[PDB]
């Protein structure tokens, strides 16, 4: 139960990233988990871009900031290794640390 806490700004990017592990870190060992979410930060966003001090111009946006547990039952090198070889996919913050 080593918890690789995958996250991104968008749902689209974390989807592609977990879908590689649940198959490839599963190859000869664990039933590796990956869809299982956390308190996903669906809030509202406000930054000022008013060209002078006059009415509003604080253009309100929306976010996903979506997060999941990848879970590996044993460190078993002969099954996990593809997730450590996945280093090149920089845009997903993986928080392996436990």
């Amino acid at each position: 139960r080593i918890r690789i806490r995958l996250k991104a700004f968008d749902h689209r990017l974390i989807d592609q990233a977990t879908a590689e592990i649940v198959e490839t870190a599963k190859r000869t060992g664990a039933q590796v988990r990956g869809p299982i979410p956390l308190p996903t930060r669906k809030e509202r966003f406000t930054v000022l871009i008013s060209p002078h001090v006059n009415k509003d111009a604080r253009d309100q946006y929306e976010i996903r900031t979506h997060l999941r547990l990848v879970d590996i039952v044993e460190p078993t090198e002969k099954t996990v290794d593809a997730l450590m070889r996945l280093d090149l996919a920089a845009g997903v913050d993986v928080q392996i640390s436990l």
Binding site: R44, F45, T46, V47, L48, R58
Partner: protein, 96 residues
């Protein structure tokens, strides 16, 4: 008291280990109530100005100390920009 004692803290703040909290790791053990050597503490207490834990602090994003919100790292007057750049992530429509 505006820019003030900054000039006095900056010259001794970074050495609070050397003044106490690593200089203590042999002689300060005996010197405690739990250990009773009565002779000792009273001759480590002399540095007075550095004497930790004491730091007047540096609110930086405000040029002077109109207070300082330790939960948030900003002055007591400063809140309203965080609705206009997100530095307080629960700053939304008020609970009253």
């Amino acid at each position: 008291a505006k820019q003030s004692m900054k000039a006095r803290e900056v010259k001794r703040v970074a050495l609070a280990d050397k003044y106490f909290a690593k200089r203590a790791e042999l002689k300060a053990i005996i010197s405690d109530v739990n250990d009773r050597w009565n002779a000792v503490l009273k001759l480590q207490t002399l540095p007075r100005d550095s004497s930790p834990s004491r730091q007047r602090n540096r609110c930086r994003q405000t040029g002077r100390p109109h207070g300082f919100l330790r939960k948030f790292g900003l002055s007591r007057i400063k809140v309203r920009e965080a609705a206009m750049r997100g530095e307080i992530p629960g700053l939304k429509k008020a609970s009253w």
